[PDB]
Design an enzyme around this catalytic site. Sequence first.
Site, PDB file in Angstrom:
ATOM      1  N   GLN G  10     106.183 -51.018  71.829  1.00 31.27           N
ATOM      2  CA  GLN G  10     105.996 -51.965  70.738  1.00 31.27           C
ATOM      3  C   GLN G  10     106.999 -53.100  70.821  1.00 31.27           C
ATOM      4  O   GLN G  10     106.644 -54.264  70.617  1.00 31.27           O
ATOM      5  CB  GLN G  10     106.119 -51.258  69.395  1.00 31.27           C
ATOM      6  CG  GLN G  10     105.984 -52.183  68.202  1.00 31.27           C
ATOM      7  CD  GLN G  10     104.612 -52.809  68.107  1.00 31.27           C
ATOM      8  OE1 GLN G  10     104.437 -53.996  68.372  1.00 31.27           O
ATOM      9  NE2 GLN G  10     103.624 -52.006  67.736  1.00 31.27           N
ATOM     10  N   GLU G  61      98.942 -47.677  71.599  1.00 28.07           N
ATOM     11  CA  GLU G  61      98.139 -48.109  70.473  1.00 28.07           C
ATOM     12  C   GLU G  61      97.485 -49.445  70.791  1.00 28.07           C
ATOM     13  O   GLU G  61      98.063 -50.277  71.490  1.00 28.07           O
ATOM     14  CB  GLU G  61      98.990 -48.256  69.223  1.00 28.07           C
ATOM     15  CG  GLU G  61     100.105 -49.273  69.346  1.00 28.07           C
ATOM     16  CD  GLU G  61     101.269 -48.983  68.421  1.00 28.07           C
ATOM     17  OE1 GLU G  61     102.359 -48.612  68.915  1.00 28.07           O
ATOM     18  OE2 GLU G  61     101.094 -49.128  67.193  1.00 28.07           O
ATOM     19  N   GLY G 134     108.510 -44.076  71.602  1.00 30.23           N
ATOM     20  CA  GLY G 134     107.891 -43.002  72.343  1.00 30.23           C
ATOM     21  C   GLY G 134     107.362 -43.441  73.684  1.00 30.23           C
ATOM     22  O   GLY G 134     107.634 -42.802  74.702  1.00 30.23           O
ATOM     23  N   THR G 135     106.602 -44.531  73.703  1.00 31.89           N
ATOM     24  CA  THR G 135     106.041 -45.004  74.959  1.00 31.89           C
ATOM     25  C   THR G 135     107.094 -45.710  75.794  1.00 31.89           C
ATOM     26  O   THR G 135     107.236 -45.436  76.990  1.00 31.89           O
ATOM     27  CB  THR G 135     104.877 -45.947  74.694  1.00 31.89           C
ATOM     28  OG1 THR G 135     105.393 -47.192  74.220  1.00 31.89           O
ATOM     29  CG2 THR G 135     103.956 -45.367  73.651  1.00 31.89           C
ATOM     30  N   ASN G 196     120.458 -54.104  68.092  1.00 34.12           N
ATOM     31  CA  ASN G 196     119.849 -54.838  66.993  1.00 34.12           C
ATOM     32  C   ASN G 196     120.820 -55.189  65.888  1.00 34.12           C
ATOM     33  O   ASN G 196     120.653 -56.223  65.246  1.00 34.12           O
ATOM     34  CB  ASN G 196     118.694 -54.040  66.383  1.00 34.12           C
ATOM     35  CG  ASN G 196     117.388 -54.293  67.084  1.00 34.12           C
ATOM     36  OD1 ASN G 196     116.994 -55.434  67.287  1.00 34.12           O
ATOM     37  ND2 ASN G 196     116.708 -53.224  67.468  1.00 34.12           N
ATOM     38  N   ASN G 218     113.554 -61.822  68.712  1.00 35.62           N
ATOM     39  CA  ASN G 218     112.866 -61.958  69.982  1.00 35.62           C
ATOM     40  C   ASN G 218     113.021 -63.360  70.546  1.00 35.62           C
ATOM     41  O   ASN G 218     113.059 -63.532  71.767  1.00 35.62           O
ATOM     42  CB  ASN G 218     111.397 -61.596  69.808  1.00 35.62           C
ATOM     43  CG  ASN G 218     111.206 -60.192  69.279  1.00 35.62           C
ATOM     44  OD1 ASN G 218     112.100 -59.356  69.365  1.00 35.62           O
ATOM     45  ND2 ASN G 218     110.032 -59.926  68.729  1.00 35.62           N
ATOM     46  N   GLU G 244     121.882 -60.993  93.297  1.00 33.60           N
ATOM     47  CA  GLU G 244     123.330 -61.102  93.198  1.00 33.60           C
ATOM     48  C   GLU G 244     123.893 -60.152  92.156  1.00 33.60           C
ATOM     49  O   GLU G 244     124.924 -59.516  92.395  1.00 33.60           O
ATOM     50  CB  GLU G 244     123.725 -62.532  92.864  1.00 33.60           C
ATOM     51  CG  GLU G 244     123.123 -63.544  93.793  1.00 33.60           C
ATOM     52  CD  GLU G 244     124.013 -63.831  94.975  1.00 33.60           C
ATOM     53  OE1 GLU G 244     125.010 -63.103  95.154  1.00 33.60           O
ATOM     54  OE2 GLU G 244     123.721 -64.786  95.723  1.00 33.60           O
TER      55      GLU G 244
HETATM   56  N1  LIG Z   1     114.442 -56.350  69.256  1.00 32.76           N
HETATM   57  C1  LIG Z   1     113.332 -55.842  68.740  1.00 32.76           C
HETATM   58  N2  LIG Z   1     113.215 -54.479  68.587  1.00 32.76           N
HETATM   59  C2  LIG Z   1     112.094 -53.948  68.069  1.00 32.76           C
HETATM   60  C3  LIG Z   1     111.062 -54.775  67.689  1.00 32.76           C
HETATM   61  N3  LIG Z   1     110.077 -54.004  67.207  1.00 32.76           N
HETATM   62  C4  LIG Z   1     110.459 -52.714  67.273  1.00 32.76           C
HETATM   63  N4  LIG Z   1     111.710 -52.664  67.798  1.00 32.76           N
HETATM   64  C5  LIG Z   1     112.479 -51.443  68.049  1.00 32.76           C
HETATM   65  O1  LIG Z   1     111.640 -50.425  68.544  1.00 32.76           O
HETATM   66  C6  LIG Z   1     112.198 -49.178  68.204  1.00 32.76           C
HETATM   67  C7  LIG Z   1     111.146 -48.092  68.037  1.00 32.76           C
HETATM   68  O2  LIG Z   1     110.194 -48.110  69.073  1.00 32.76           O
HETATM   69  P1  LIG Z   1     108.926 -49.055  68.871  1.00 32.76           P
HETATM   70  O3  LIG Z   1     109.041 -50.210  69.824  1.00 32.76           O
HETATM   71  O4  LIG Z   1     108.893 -49.501  67.437  1.00 32.76           O
HETATM   72  O5  LIG Z   1     107.627 -48.179  69.195  1.00 32.76           O
HETATM   73  P2  LIG Z   1     107.442 -47.634  70.678  1.00 32.76           P
HETATM   74  O6  LIG Z   1     108.653 -47.981  71.495  1.00 32.76           O
HETATM   75  O7  LIG Z   1     106.185 -48.223  71.245  1.00 32.76           O
HETATM   76  O8  LIG Z   1     107.261 -46.054  70.531  1.00 32.76           O
HETATM   77  P3  LIG Z   1     106.018 -45.503  69.687  1.00 32.76           P
HETATM   78  O9  LIG Z   1     106.088 -46.013  68.267  1.00 32.76           O
HETATM   79  O10 LIG Z   1     106.056 -44.000  69.695  1.00 32.76           O
HETATM   80  O11 LIG Z   1     104.747 -45.967  70.343  1.00 32.76           O
HETATM   81  C8  LIG Z   1     112.928 -49.404  66.900  1.00 32.76           C
HETATM   82  O12 LIG Z   1     114.223 -48.871  66.990  1.00 32.76           O
HETATM   83  C9  LIG Z   1     113.029 -50.900  66.751  1.00 32.76           C
HETATM   84  O13 LIG Z   1     114.375 -51.262  66.604  1.00 32.76           O
HETATM   85  C10 LIG Z   1     111.173 -56.141  67.841  1.00 32.76           C
HETATM   86  O14 LIG Z   1     110.255 -56.874  67.504  1.00 32.76           O
HETATM   87  N5  LIG Z   1     112.313 -56.682  68.370  1.00 32.76           N
HETATM   88 MG   LIG Z   2     105.285 -47.644  69.542  1.00 26.59          MG
END
Ligand SMILES: Nc1nc2c(ncn2[C@@H]2O[C@H](COP(=O)(O)OP(=O)(O)OP(=O)(O)O)[C@@H](O)[C@H]2O)c(=O)[nH]1
Ligand SMILES: [Mg+2]
Lengths: 85, 62, 626, 426, 184, 62, 427
Positions: G10, G61, G134-135, G196, G218, G244
């Site tokens: 995500q 997803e 997770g992913t 973050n 982002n 490098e």
């Molecule tokens: N820097 C940044 N971090 C994000 C953003 N969206 C989600 N995260 C981070 O993603 C972490 C959780 O994993 P997610 O990316 O939300 O979801 P995922 O990695 O796909 O794992 P699943 O939900 O199981 O599919 C959280 O700790 C958030 O801090 C974003 O837009 N920018």
């Molecule tokens: Mg996710």
Amino acid sequence: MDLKQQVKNYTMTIRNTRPPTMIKEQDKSEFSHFRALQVLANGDEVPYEATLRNVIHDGARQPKLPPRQTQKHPGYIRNESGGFF
Amino acid sequence: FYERGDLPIAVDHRGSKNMIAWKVDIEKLDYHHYLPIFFDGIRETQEPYRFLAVKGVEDMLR
Amino acid sequence: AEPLVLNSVIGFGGAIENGLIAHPDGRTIIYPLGSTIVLRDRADPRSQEFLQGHSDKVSCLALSRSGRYLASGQITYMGFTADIIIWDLESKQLIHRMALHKVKVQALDFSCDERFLASLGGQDDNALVLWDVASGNAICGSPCNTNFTNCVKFFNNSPDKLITAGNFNMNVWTYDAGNNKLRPTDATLGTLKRVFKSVVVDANDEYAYCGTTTGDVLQIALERVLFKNTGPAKGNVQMGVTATCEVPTGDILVGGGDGSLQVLRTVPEPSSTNPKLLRKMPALAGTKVEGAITSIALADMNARGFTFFVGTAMCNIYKVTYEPATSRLKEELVQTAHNDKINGMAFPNEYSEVFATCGTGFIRLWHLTTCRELLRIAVPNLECFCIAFTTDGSAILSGWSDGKIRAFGPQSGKIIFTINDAHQKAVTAIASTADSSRILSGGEEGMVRVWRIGRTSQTLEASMKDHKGPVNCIRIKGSGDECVSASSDGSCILWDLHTFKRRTSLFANTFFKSVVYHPDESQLVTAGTDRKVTYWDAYDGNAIRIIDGSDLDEVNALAVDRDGEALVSGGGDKLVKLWGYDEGHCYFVGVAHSGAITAVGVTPDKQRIVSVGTEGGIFIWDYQRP
Amino acid sequence: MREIVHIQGGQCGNQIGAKFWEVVSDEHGIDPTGTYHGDSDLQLERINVYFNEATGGRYVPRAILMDLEPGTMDSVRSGPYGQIFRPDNFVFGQTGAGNNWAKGHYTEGAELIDSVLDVVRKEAESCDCLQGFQVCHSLGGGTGSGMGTLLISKIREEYPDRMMLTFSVVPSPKVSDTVVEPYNATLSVHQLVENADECMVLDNEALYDICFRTLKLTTPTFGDLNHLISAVMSGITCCLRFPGQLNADLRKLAVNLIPFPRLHFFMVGFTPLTSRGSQQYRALTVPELTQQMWDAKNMMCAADPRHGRYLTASALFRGRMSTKEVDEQMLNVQNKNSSYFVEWIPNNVKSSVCDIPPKGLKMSATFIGNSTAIQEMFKRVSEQFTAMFRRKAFLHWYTGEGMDEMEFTEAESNMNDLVSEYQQYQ
Amino acid sequence: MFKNAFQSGFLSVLYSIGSKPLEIWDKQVSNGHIKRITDADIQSSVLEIMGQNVSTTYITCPADPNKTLGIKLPFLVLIIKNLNKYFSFEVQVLDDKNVRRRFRASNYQSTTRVKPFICTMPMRLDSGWNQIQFNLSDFTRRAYGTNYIETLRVQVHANCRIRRIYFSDRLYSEEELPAEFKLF
Amino acid sequence: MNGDVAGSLFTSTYRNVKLAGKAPPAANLSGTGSCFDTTSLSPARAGAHKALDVQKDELPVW
Amino acid sequence: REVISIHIGQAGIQVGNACWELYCLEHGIQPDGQMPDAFNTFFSETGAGKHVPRCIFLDLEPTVVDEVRTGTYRQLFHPEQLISGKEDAANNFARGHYTIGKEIVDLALDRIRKLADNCTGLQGFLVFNAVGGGTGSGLGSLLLERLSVDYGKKSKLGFTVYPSPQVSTAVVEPYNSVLSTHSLLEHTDVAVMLDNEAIYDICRRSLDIERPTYTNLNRLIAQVISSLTASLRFDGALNVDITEFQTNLVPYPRIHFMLSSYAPIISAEKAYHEQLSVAEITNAAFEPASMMVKCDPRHGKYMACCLMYRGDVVPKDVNASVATIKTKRTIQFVDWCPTGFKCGINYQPPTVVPGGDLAKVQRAVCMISNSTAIGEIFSRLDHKFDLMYAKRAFVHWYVGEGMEEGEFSEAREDLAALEKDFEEVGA
Ligand SMILES: Nc1nc2c(ncn2[C@@H]2O[C@H](COP(=O)(O)OP(=O)(O)OP(=O)(O)O)[C@@H](O)[C@H]2O)c(=O)[nH]1
Ligand SMILES: [Mg+2]
Ligand SMILES: Nc1nc2c(ncn2[C@@H]2O[C@H](COP(=O)(O)OP(=O)(O)O)[C@@H](O)[C@H]2O)c(=O)[nH]1
């Protein structure tokens, strides 16, 4: 990956190759509507129906919100030193 | 055929002239089915294809 | 001080339930505008005198059977009793004003002998109050139900009435002058738990017809208040039944919540050889209407057909003829207007009979001379702000709430270009320069941006962030160098094209709203919520003279003539000021735009003044000398 | 793509489900006849989760109605948004069980559940990729608890790899309608801890309390209580149906909130809840939502969370919001009330943001807390059960139908070890 | 279509369990009927095509007749139920000579004809459910000297209960077959 | 193939009259009279198709 | 010289949603995919008048993926780049690494195969994933394993998002982070941490936005990536390549974890405020109030450092700036590296994104360094990892997927060994 997504991708590749369309939906036509304008300027007895022509575009997908307030009144909150963001 | 993707070919992308990572071993391959394909691909001028075709022909013949 | 003659008027409220109502005699239609009802000659489109007197938006209408007395109610601020006003249609005078309902008066109704009025009010109040019309007195009142109630109607003998809930009930209330009380008997719905919207009583009080929100008409037998077969057999209507009228014959014309008209046969019939009656079969599925229907009125009595005036939530008055001989509905919309508030309007350079008025989700190209709207383009769900033509007639630039600037073509309405991010939020001012290569934009962030539009691309040049308030207006000069930006900081900045810089900054105690150049760049005229018009010297910047015109509320609209002798001013109040330029003098008109006016302009050929208020109305005035 | 199959049992389940499908249809903009009439296009992309498309552009709900008496089915088809259900979904008995768990699990189940299973199985294969099953029922009634519980057992025997939600109201002594409440609740709890994945316990005393204090309504009819539970259920699946900045799947909620396979009894909350008289004097900010969210008087259970500890908690926000505000607010509530969380689990607050608010509001949230104060509720029931079962009161209408005494003894054992293990983790 | 897909060891073109199984297929029903019912021997939903005349009712794989799916997998596997009625299924294939042959396997013929465009084959079935594997490449090499390249379309006729028709690259056995493609 | 045929009688009839809401065909109740007392047996035959069309004058002429 | 960038999870896809917006903005590409040689490292021009990116977004997803499919950049991406599964991993490492990974990863790598084949001078890979999810952690580690068994030799720049100490949006992220790090160790060559909390403070402090969304985070992460790849994209006075970082920053085969920073993060008004020169921004790039990972480097000692510069920068003042810094004692280096700096200069200034808050600055610095502050971070995550594993919490979800406690214990002792290596090297 699955059959569903595969057929979706096929359709979308076709749709992307096509040049972008300015109008999502078109009501009546420019030429038919244009003639109505001509007979209106020439004289009378033109129904409102013919002159009024409408066009619909894509616009935003979202539903409509009142605008979000990013900042409150500057008197309430300040950054570490001070100032109004 | 490469578009369909049934060829056991990839590029190494080395610092020298890149070579062909052969997924299967080259010795046990069917030459009756592949040599004409590679030899027909030499006509290509597009960058991703002509390199593979010539290097595959070279390697099979060696 | 002398009043200004008011030419044509375009705009009406359709959101109000059962608002559009016709006169029983001759040529008169009447609908509620923002907070004043408007009469019109049914024959010719010549505006009739308005009836002022309401503090806030009118939310209901009622007319006596004879057409002598008229009643209206308004919605008010939370915690202040709303008042019903009764007018005389022979002498247009406020006769009675009565305030009992707390928040809003839901609906009104007259008696057949016009001896009584009935007022039910309040989404929270839910109290039925009976009034007598002879004097502004209330006979008796009763709390109606637990769940709220929408509409009441009197019978055609008028001892009794019937009321229905929003949610889940329906009663018939009989009145006796023995206790001076109202006795209710509630309807016997077997198991139905429908949500009723509108009711109409028959021409002989044998049944009543209520439109549910589920989308079916429900016929209620009166006296025992027992429910009778349901509405359209061929399925329900696409939304809640919201409009109902009774054809003079044994028929009912029902307008569904999605622009659908249907004639329904009301006489019962048993089919399949049974004691059970079959559902009301529709004698005629009338043609569709674009807007959600809210008001139906029977206009005329003609032996070859019946005409009805139909209002819509999209604010499109339709006339429909029903020919009972050959079952067909023909529809012609006669007027349209804006549904929501409007903000900003535009004029093409040195062209007269075109308007660009843009409200929520819509841009509208009006033809001034006849008022017949020409072309309307809609982005589905977005809010439009400052609209502006280009000095060359090609592009029509429009800001939007999502922060995107879009330009359309005047013919065919085809979008030419869009900026997927002009600002972080809604943009509030946009201006084209004379050479049509540059475009000035201002959003709420307070940053003024300049965009060079290339023949296939559009790029952003330097963007200045002097302001801390939302930019309210932007005006460019004859030469491309100068543009001024008025924001809510209390400052107006002058900029420089050749160097994206500022020369000086005009400063006022209150936020500057509107700002106009004097013709030939001698001076600036600024108007804001300081209630004070201010002249400024264009070159070095200085307060020349402060006029205290319209001190009671804020002034947000300045327009200037082409020579520069006169100056039109809007206000937070309902009157339009017409000043002379060199001298602080008035020629203003008072009675218009029941809601505060938001923009005003004068046609290039100096013949008319055009005003748009916070309610959906555009008022074409006649220009005169100051 | 991810599919929720809704099952309604008993009278309470059917009336709650009636309001639930009402609110859902209002969110996705379909009329009470079954045609789409919204405007935005966010609602078209995610109706396959809830409405099998039908010929005529009609979206009919994916719900299986299950009861034993024609009275409730009439009340379902009666009210608005009643003509949208598919008539063949009404799996349905004829007599009624009426507060008899044995009649809901041994007598009528043996001849009704083959039918309801065939419709559920047929409805499951109607969609492509199942996400989970979601049942709404009671624990006091007969046709709801007993029938729904044997259904839960049969389904988890069939599809062991799909999630499971149970919106179950529980008895309270202050609002005590029937008399055998402990006799039905104990056996249902003993089965739900071994078949259900997680349970969202509701109660009517807390709902009436909420409508008295915070809403300040005069007469809280059942239409309002079911409206609040309907808003909660729409809040729990807003994330699958709408895109946001931090999407939280149902299985994502389960893994964040269930540290142990038996510690899966939640308490739920919902905000904003204010009267009309105070709707104007309040603001719409994340702290305003959060102060109301973590308030003990806004839980929908009869269990004071301050009488125990929070194992884990979750919050689902809806509306255009700033994630920094969300995280730092959860940071403040976690640092200020540090004693009320457990120590051996860091970061006990999972949060999520969705980009679409519910209709009629500007912004909303939803609180789901796996606390250990819920053992108060189960103690409150088990002590009643022991009071009767020392006497064998009312016992013969049960033992005379096929059930034995060993069921009651084992149910007491399982309830006792469950509350003992909640107390251990406190 | 299907030319930019991945085309791994397994490829399913129609499966009887989904929101829209006949999303690419164009149904042509006349004197017949199509249903999605639950069979009593596998406890699953199957698609049923039944009509009086076998030649009238069928379902072709790519909806638009000019548009042709392209699949390079050798083996085609159908999971059908034998109803002791007449049933047939036909596939178009492309050779190396860029010609289109057709292979029609029919339940009610005895002879095996080889014609320039059509090879009609007899087919015998067992009683209950059965999966059939076609081996497109070998049939092409036998009926003509050419070899197999692409499968352009597939079309099944009346009097059959079908579920999970899919392509493959190998003659998979049961234990090595995954679960969702297995019979029970 | 139903294991018990009468298992659907009540529910199916109730469903058509109420659930689906379809008009229930309610005929052939003439002469049944009341309960508790014998229905007068009519001499009509249930199976017989006594249409016997009579288009006496609606017949077009060759 | 071309580099391909894959996004997993995500977070990864949303960062890429900002990165590729900035890229087409720099090389002047309208969102429909055509201009009205420098682009060649990112966008391949196929057919005629069309540019497609060198990236694959993949997730399980369909929500965020088809958000991109229906957002502004519909015409830009080729619809086969955007891989989408059916159902989440849902914060479960084993679910993302064994159950659904086994079906999705082959499709993924046999899509990047023909990506690399279309490429000719492939510089390396660079991945975008958040290990808390997770992913992004599960199948990200599966993909990294299979990419390393395919190529092995090539540099894999990993810009991973770690969980912050106190600000958190998940509960099992300690488990997910440790199991990801157990593969992040021996598969990637250069791994850059991006937390973050640190970025929230940055946009609160310097950019002075009080309500920042993920969009702003982002955006400035897209600024960092562009600032360290502009050397390949444009010609500078002193350009340094992606191979490098492999050589100058990684003194030991396992110590590859880099603290990043970026300066000047300056609002629109503070641009006219401050006099932008090189000495102060080289100073501002070193204070912990401008780093992307929430840690205090004063507790640590630097191992190596790399400074990319953009804009109107001559090498004289950067020589003077790094001179003053090496003479300062507020920060201390390690004895194993006297020459601890690596400069790199590019001519073009950084661009602004309409809709951002950053003003047009004439020069910018991007610091990618190596320290032992990361050795403090891994101990902080390991401490809260053993707190949960002491009670065997949440373990049944993993074992129920098919895994065991063996990889839990071995990942735990792996971070222990890494901690020992950090404290040994810092001496
Ligand atoms: N820097 C940044 N971090 C994000 C953003 N969206 C989600 N995260 C981070 O993603 C972490 C959780 O994993 P997610 O990316 O939300 O979801 P995922 O990695 O796909 O794992 P699943 O939900 O199981 O599919 C959280 O700790 C958030 O801090 C974003 O837009 N920018
Ligand atoms: Mg996710
Ligand atoms: N919230 C709510 N609770 C209800 C409703 N109907 C019944 N209940 C509760 O359900 C409990 C008993 O459930 P019951 O009616 O016996 O379930 P059933 O007979 O098996 O269908 C009582 O305590 C009621 O308070 C309802 O419409 N809303």
